[PDB]
Design a binder for this molecule. Structure first.
Ligand code: GTP
Ligand code: GDP
Ligand code: MG
Lengths: 430, 77, 199, 434, 49, 369
């Protein structure tokens, strides 16, 4: 029933995906042993979207795990919820990529992807009706960015009509932990613009900032950050699994949110986020929820939207509420901040309502926005790229195994063109 | 940011009244491990989401047919 | 008569018709479960013999009344007259799950203890003091002014509210579902107090 | 003998048909299971048909491509009422795209829908017409409704069609690409519908607020109001009264020209259970509240235009003598103005049955009510603002690739725009004096 | 063929009114009988005062 | 000080729907105040109405400002705890040897402080009286008691009060009446007992026995026929205000002592349309029907049947004029003069026509049964 399959690659995808399947299993009332122990009948009506039922009555997720090393796959198997994943869905090499884009995309990626493409193909035709794909990986790494983008290309030529989503962890220079980020960041971005239908960029610095200020947690960990990302992921497909007043699936998001084919990079956010020690001292109302979700410091990207103008935004409300407030608040925030919304498109905000909120919460909102302020990520990456490519430093590894500087020039050129056109409509008037 | 610093491990009490002492106390009270359990595993659910009010309401479409007026069953005349 | 293997023959006949209508990717338990929920309008969770006969008629397995009574009687062990289709559907799921020594079929044949609502009550009761468990037993006895051994719907709400637990509607439904198995309208507090205290 | 067939396509159509059929069942005393305890005139024959022994089944058909709303209808309290194969459910949602529901995925459901409607018509013997409830600013609503209208208009011919559409509000709306689908649906319905009623959402929000003192309105209240309007309009077809009006006396009184059949509705009295019994509720004042501009269910100001024809359907204990005095006072009033070539502009229908009230609702139990369907030249404002919205975003060809890539030809936008402009010009010309 | 049912229905509603007036008249005389009884007694009670 | 808060529920007539309020009761100075669930507005604020403490209980009906309210349940733990103690039920039974002492038995029960929730008089047949007292069988007391029970009319009762299961017995006295005279002379049996098997009344011993008897006697599924005649008799109704004022014991004995044989009496709760049709003989008739009809449904009432050689006028002689103010002057020793207070609450009500007494008693014991 318009079910979606999940593909997770690299170290980020494995860690984010593992935390993601914990939230969904909790939401659907599935124990780590795979046996249903839920509460309401609503939890089984659309369980086929994310799970497959095996003989014997246990439900197994339809996920594929990717890596060039067994370093992270053994830990997730040994960790909690690690028995859900089918062992035939684990595919890995024995060499690793070593933070090299070409190794995961030309030499080792090419030889290994033949096996995994068989697993995805078997998973897709087994189910009745596909709805699309969703991808979790990293662009600043070797195996995630290298092999990950190759499979996007491979599956795109086989399923040209199905939608496809990505949750991309693009690097930020403030959290400097790799010296070769600008090279393989641009290459992945160049390949991602012709194939991916929806891209949602994520930054660690933005995630770290939210934990310190909003949650007021003295010292966080990847476990906390992985949960925030997983929260946004489940909120996007909320109306695809539960009854509501205004249902909206993945395709309905793209139609409302993508004006032009090359403008499909988004920045997301989640609300409400509240510290443990101050939860009972504030009220949960739609005016409060809408106030935080437009806060410039609440989104998962370091870019400030107040430095650009929104083209289109979408809000996916959850829980029990009245549509009058939802429609009135969207109009209210669109009028008092008319300088932040581009004029030549009227009513550029979409709203949707789903009756079932996440467990333990009354109301929640997932915000997905398409603003010109995302050019800062590409502008800043390009600046570091040309500063390092000028001296041809750190270059012989790529060129020594079938890579050429020509498509380095091509990748930088196309991304620079994307930046120019993306902020062109900021200055455009009717 | 100079957190941790001059407040090491402790159980119960207000602490040393420096930095983030207040927020950590309620976190410590609700779950034993108020600051980054060393590598008593930590569950990210309560630290991020918060207190859970578990309840699953109706879909508002199974709300049309059900509606009852107690007065209409009176014997009248 | 129909005490002998004729009783189990109808199950095989009934199982085949369930399998024929079984949707792809689904077990036989869900297929027959939706049939029973379709008929009962109270949504209580239990059905009588008249509803049970109608549900079988939907699948096409219509027999004479004397055969239908035995099928109802076999599963209605307590002879209360109200069967739970939760146990009925689970029984047929294991029948179609096949026989395999390597894999267990789990499934459900009896309503489980709810679990976390009981555990939360036990943890909260420990905060009041050493005699908190006395108060819960004392409250039930004093609220039950008539000494009958059971409490009603609203009375159970008051006893929990008197202690100081503001449980939500869903939590009451789960707790009341297991303890009042066939919906007599009353719950035996003696069983409830035993489970919350422990072993 | 006399029956209507109601078509419910789209999320809004189904979510309002829920309230419509709830109200019909409660009004005719039919239990949700289908049996009528009664305790016998055949006043239900319009909406329900007997099975020969016991239950009554509606003459209803439900269409949608996403199974979400259909499944919950099959699951809820009305599971035993509707015919199991009369709730048609598709596979993939149209996803807010007009071209999707009209060219590629909506072409595989019209065959089934036409087969079911043909079976229903064959079962019927004295079919009066069709009632269509659909959403305009959506994908599967506009496109599939347009395709169904095109099919029916050639398949059946002269049978009357009445539509209750939901136009986008000037400022309060959900989708962003809604101007395209709205314009295309207007071009489709202009030639194939005989009566259209505007039912935008923001106006009803103001009605509920200002009347019922409710600060948290929801779609349920709006659907209940729409169902009340439908029942008040169709009561005279099935209940006894002094002056009876059927649907062919409706068009003949309300459609001056073939291309002018767009109308908007008003309802009164709409009062809570607290303020109802301190107020007079006379016939003279409910007809004033009906003509009050703020009480109409479409966000339009009648004071900027003229009136061409008004239909007034009274139900309750109304006396024909008082209606004449109230109409005379209304005509004497100078704020409300008519067109010169329309000396008489009122058609009156009276029904004996008092309005029915649903338990747990917001409206009180009253003894008199009136619903007024009026044709006016002021409706051109909504088309004007929709055209203004369309041209502003079509200059840079925004979201066009979503439509061309599915099979829509780009040249249809220009045709729809020209048709809307011609309709506006036709409305402008009629309003002038002679 | 439905005219048979209409005729019987009119017969019943015609007869109920016919039987209603007889019942009302029989109860109306008790209204007058009790009024005279209490009326005389008040005169007796007043005279005793 | 301390506050008692209930939930009340009033049925409107002009509006079909029914409403609900709080009816806060400041017991420090006995003042009434009502607040409503919906629309959050104070209804009636801090005004005294002289509402007594004893009438506050679940299911009670109290009238304020011409709109009568019905308590349905409590609203908080503090209010619930105070009044949940007074909920005990017990089965009081009057044996057919103390038939002439019914009024005296009832009165001292009333001054004991207990409350009679329900009451009815009937004759237990041979078979059901044998099933009753079923725990005895082998004892020789069983056969004698079974033969005694089916002798004549019996009065059954259900008492509600604090510690009623044992407070009933301690005034009831020792089970043997002979030893009662020297141990506790002031007791039911000490005053009205002859011997062991002919003791005055019967009481409940265990709560399980209380359940067994109460469902045997006052439940809907009961096989006890309301044994009553319908010839040579009139009906008299004890108005609710007498029940509230606690004189019902002082009226039954006074009626019995005048030579009138009572055949059946039962407890009734009736609504306004039902009470309206009872006085249909008084509809547009002299006595200003509205107030007397409204008051009759303002609470619990006792309905009695009186049998005598000349039932109608002879009983009407001892009832007196329907106005107690004029009765007191001229007929000082009549029921209405001694018990009635004003025109609308004139104590007892008796039919006052020779021929309509047969249907008057038939309405309560056949039509309304
Ligand atoms: N008043 C009212 N309007 C509704 C309701 N449901 C949907 N709508 C209208 O429908 C419009 C959006 O289209 P939907 O009905 O949600 O979806 P659709 O028409 O079925 O088309 P798809 O999105 O392709 O499925 C909104 O702008 C609403 O105005 C409802 O229950 N009440
Ligand atoms: N938010 C988050 N970021 C992670 C996690 N694991 C790794 N990262 C980030 O990913 C970057 C390294 O990417 P890497 O794993 O080497 O990519 P790969 O080699 O292709 O798998 C680092 O900068 C980390 O900040 C995680 O669990 N959560
Ligand atoms: Mg839809």
């Amino acid at each position: 029933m318009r079910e979606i399959v999940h593909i997770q690659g690299g170290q980020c995808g494995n860690q984010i995906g593992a935390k993601f399947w914990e939230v969904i299993s909790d939401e659907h009332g599935i124990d780590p042993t795979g046996t249903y122990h839920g509460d309401s009948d609503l939890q089984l009506e659309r369980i086929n979207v994310y799970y497959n039922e095996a003989t014997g009555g246990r439900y197994v997720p339809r996920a594929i795990l990717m890596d060039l090393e067994p370093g992270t796959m053994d830990s997730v198997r040994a960790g909690p919820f690690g028995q859900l994943f089918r062992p035939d869905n684990f595919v890995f090499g024995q060499t690793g990529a070593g933070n090299n884009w070409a190794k995961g995309h030309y030499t080792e990626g090419a030889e290994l992807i033949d096996s995994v493409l068989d697993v995805v193909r078997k998973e897709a035709e087994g189910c009745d009706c596909l709805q699309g794909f969703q991808i979790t990986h990293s662009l600043g790494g070797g195996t995630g960015s290298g092999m990950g983008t190759l499979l996007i290309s491979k599956v795109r030529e086989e399923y040209p009509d199905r939608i496809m989503e990505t949750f991309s962890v693009v690097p930020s220079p403030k959290v400097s932990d790799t010296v070769v980020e600008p090279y393989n960041a641009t290459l992945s971005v160049h390949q991602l613009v012709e194939n991916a239908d929806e891209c949602m960029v994520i930054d660690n610095e933005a995630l770290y900032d939210i934990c310190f200020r909003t949650l007021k947690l003295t010292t966080p960990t990847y476990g906390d950050l992985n949960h925030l990302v997983s929260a946004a992921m489940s909120g996007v497909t909320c109306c695809l699994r539960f009854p509501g007043q205004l249902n909206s699936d993945l395709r309905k998001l793209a139609v409302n949110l993508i004006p032009f084919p090359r403008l499909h990079f988004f920045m997301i956010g989640f609300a409400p986020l509240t510290s443990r020690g101050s939860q009972q001292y504030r009220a949960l109302t739609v005016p409060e929820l809408t106030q935080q979700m437009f806060d410039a410091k609440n989104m998962m990207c370091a870019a400030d939207p107040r430095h650009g103008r929104y083209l289109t935004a979408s809000a996916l409300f959850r829980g029990r509420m009245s549509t009058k407030e939802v429609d009135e608040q969207m109009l209210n925030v669109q009028n008092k901040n008319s300088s932040y919304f581009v004029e030549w498109i009227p009513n550029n905000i979409k709203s949707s309502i789903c009756d079932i909120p996440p467990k333990g919460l009354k109301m929640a909102v997932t915000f997905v926005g398409n603003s010109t302020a995302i050019q800062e990520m590409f502008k800043r990456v390009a600046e570091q790229f040309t500063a390092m490519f000028r001296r041809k430093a750190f270059l012989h590894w790529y060129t020594g195994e079938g890579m050429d500087e020509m498509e380095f020039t091509e990748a930088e050129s196309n991304m620079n063109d994307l930046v120019s056109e993306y902020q062109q409509y900021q200055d455009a008037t009717a | 940011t100079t957190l941790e610093s001059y407040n090491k491990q402790l159980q119960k009490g207000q602490g040393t009244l420096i930095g983030n002492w207040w927020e950590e106390r309620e976190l410590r009270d609700v779950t034993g491990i108020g600051r980054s359990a060393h590598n008593s595993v930590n569950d990210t659910n309560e630290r991020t989401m918060g207190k859970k009010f578990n309840h699953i309401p109706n879909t508002t479409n199974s709300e049309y047919g059900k509606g009852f007026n107690k007065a209409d069953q009176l014997p009248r005349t | 008569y129909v005490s002998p293997e004729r009783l189990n023959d109808l199950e095989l006949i009934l199982y085949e018709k369930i399998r024929q209508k079984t949707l792809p990717g689904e077990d036989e338990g869900r297929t027959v479960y939706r049939a029973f929920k379709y008929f009962d309008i109270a949504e209580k969770g239990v059905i009588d013999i008249s509803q049970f006969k109608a549900a079988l008629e939907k699948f096409g397995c219509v027999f004479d009344d004397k055969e239908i009574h035995a099928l109802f009687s076999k599963f209605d062990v307590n002879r209360s007259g109200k069967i739970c289709y939760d146990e009925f559907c689970g029984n047929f799921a294991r029948l179609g799950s096949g026989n395999n020594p390597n894999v267990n079929p789990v499934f459900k044949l009896a309503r489980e203890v709810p679990s976390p609502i009981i555990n939360k009550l036990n943890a909260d009761l420990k905060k009041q003091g050493p005699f908190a468990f006395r108060s819960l037993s004392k409250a039930c006895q004093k609220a039950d002014t008539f000494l009958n051994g059971s409490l009603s719907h609203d009375e159970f709400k008051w006893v929990i509210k008197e202690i100081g637990f503001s449980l939500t509607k869903t939590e009451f439904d789960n707790l009341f579902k297991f303890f009042d198995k066939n919906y007599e309208g009353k719950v035996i507090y003696s069983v409830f107090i035993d489970l919350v205290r422990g072993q | 003998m006399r029956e209507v067939i109601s078509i419910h396509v789209g999320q809004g159509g189904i979510q309002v048909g829920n309230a419509c059929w709830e109200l019909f069942c409660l009004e005719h005393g039919i239990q949700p299971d289908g049996q009528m305890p009664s305790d016998g005139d055949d006043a239900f024959n319009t909406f329900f048909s007997e099975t020969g022994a016991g239950k009554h089944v509606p003459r209803a058909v439900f269409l949608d491509l996403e199974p979400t709303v259909i499944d919950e209808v099959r699951t809820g309290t009305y599971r035993q009422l509707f015919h199991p194969e009369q709730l048609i459910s598709g596979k993939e949602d149209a996803a807010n795209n007009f071209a999707r529901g009209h060219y590629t995925i909506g072409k595989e459901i019209v065959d089934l829908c036409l087969d079911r409607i043909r079976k229903l018509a064959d079962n019927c013997t004295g079919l009066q017409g069709f009632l269509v409830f659909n959403s305009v600013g959506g994908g599967t609503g506009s496109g599939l409704g347009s395709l169904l209208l095109e099919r029916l208009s050639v398949d059946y011919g002269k049978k009357s069609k009445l539509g209750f559409t939901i136009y986008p509000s000037p400022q309060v709306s959900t989708a962003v690409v809604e101007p395209y689908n709205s314009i295309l649906s207007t071009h489709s319905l202009l030639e194939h519908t005989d009566v259209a009623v505007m039912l935008d959402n923001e106006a009803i929000y103001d009605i509920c607020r200002r009347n019922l003192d409710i600060e948290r309105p929801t779609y349920t209240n709006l659907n209940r109001l729409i169902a009340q309007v439908i029942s008040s309009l169709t009561a005279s077809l099935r209940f006894d009264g002094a002056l009876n009006v059927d649907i062919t006396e409706f068009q003949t009184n309300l459609v001056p020209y073939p291309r002018i059949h767009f109308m908007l509705s008003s309802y009164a009295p709409i009062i809570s259970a607290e303020k109802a019994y301190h107020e007079q509720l006379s016939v003279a004042e409910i007809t004033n509240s009906a003509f009050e501009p703020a009480n109409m269910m479409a966000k339009c100001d009648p004071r900027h235009g003229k009136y061409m024809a008004c239909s007034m359907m009274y139900r309750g204990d109304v006396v024909p003598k008082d209606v004449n005095a109230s109409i005379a006072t209304i005509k004497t009033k100078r704020t409300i103005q008519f067109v010169d070539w329309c000396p008489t502009g009122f058609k009156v229908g009276i029904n004996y049955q008092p309005p029915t009230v649903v338990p747990g609702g917001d409206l009180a139990k009253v003894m008199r009510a009136v619903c007024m369907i009026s044709n006016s030249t002021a409706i051109a404002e909504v088309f004007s603002r929709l055209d203004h919205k369309f041209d502003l975003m079509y200059a840079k060809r925004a979201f066009v690739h979503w439509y061309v890539g599915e099979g829509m030809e780009e040249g249809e936008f220009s045709e729809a725009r020209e048709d809307l402009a011609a309709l506006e010009k036709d409305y402008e010309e009629v309003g002038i004096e002679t | 063929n439905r005219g048979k049912a209409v005729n019987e229905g009119n017969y019943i509603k015609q007869r109920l009114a016919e039987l209603r007036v007889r019942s009302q008249r029989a109860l109306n005389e008790r209204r007058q009988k009790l009024a005279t009884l209490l009326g005389r007694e008040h005169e007796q009670y007043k005279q005793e005062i | 000080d301390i506050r008692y808060i209930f939930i009340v529920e009033w049925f409107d007539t002009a509006a079909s729907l029914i409403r609900t309020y709080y009816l806060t009761y400041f017991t420090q100075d006995k003042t009434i105040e009502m607040y409503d669930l919906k629309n959050k507005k104070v209804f009636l604020k801090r005004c005294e109405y002289a509402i007594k403490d004893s009438d506050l209980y679940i299911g009670s009906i109290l009238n304020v400002y011409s709109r009568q309210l019905k308590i349905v349940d409590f609203a908080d733990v503090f209010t619930r705890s105070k009044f949940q103690n007074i909920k005990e039920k017990t089965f009081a039974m009057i044996k057919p040897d103390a038939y002439i002492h019914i009024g005296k038995i009832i009165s001292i029960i009333e001054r004991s402080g207990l409350q009679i929730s329900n009451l009815k008089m009937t004759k237990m047949s041979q078979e059901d009286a044998r099933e009753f007292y079923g725990e005895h069988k082998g004892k020789p007391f069983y056969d004698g008691l079974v033969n005694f029970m089916s002798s004549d009319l019996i009065v059954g009762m259900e008492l509600v009060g604090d510690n009623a299961i044992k407070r009933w017995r301690e005034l009831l006295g020792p089970t043997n009446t002979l030893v009662a005279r020297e141990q506790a002379p002031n007791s039911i049996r000490g005053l009205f007992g002859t011997d062991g098997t002919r003791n005055a009344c019967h009481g409940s011993d265990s709560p399980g026995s209380a359940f067994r008897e109460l469902n045997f006697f006052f439940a809907k599924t009961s096989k006890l026929k309301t044994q009553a005649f319908f010839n040579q008799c009139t009906c008299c109704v004890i108005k609710p205000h007498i029940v509230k004022q606690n004189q019902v014991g002082e009226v039954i004995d006074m009626i019995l002592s005048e030579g009138f044989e009572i055949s059946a009496l039962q407890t009734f709760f009736l609504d306004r349309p039902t009470a309206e049709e009872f006085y249909e003989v008084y509809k547009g008739v002299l006595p200003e029907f509205n107030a007397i009809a409204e008051h009759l449904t303002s609470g619990m009432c006792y309905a009695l049947e009186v049998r005598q050689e000349n039932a109608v006028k002879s009983f009407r002689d001892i009832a007196g004029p329907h106005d107690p103010e004029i009765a007191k002057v001229i007929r000082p020793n009549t029921i209405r003069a001694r018990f009635g207070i004003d025109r609308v609450k004139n104590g007892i009500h008796c039919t006052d026509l020779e021929d309509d007494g047969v249907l008057e008693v038939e309405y309560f014991f056949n039509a309304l049964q």
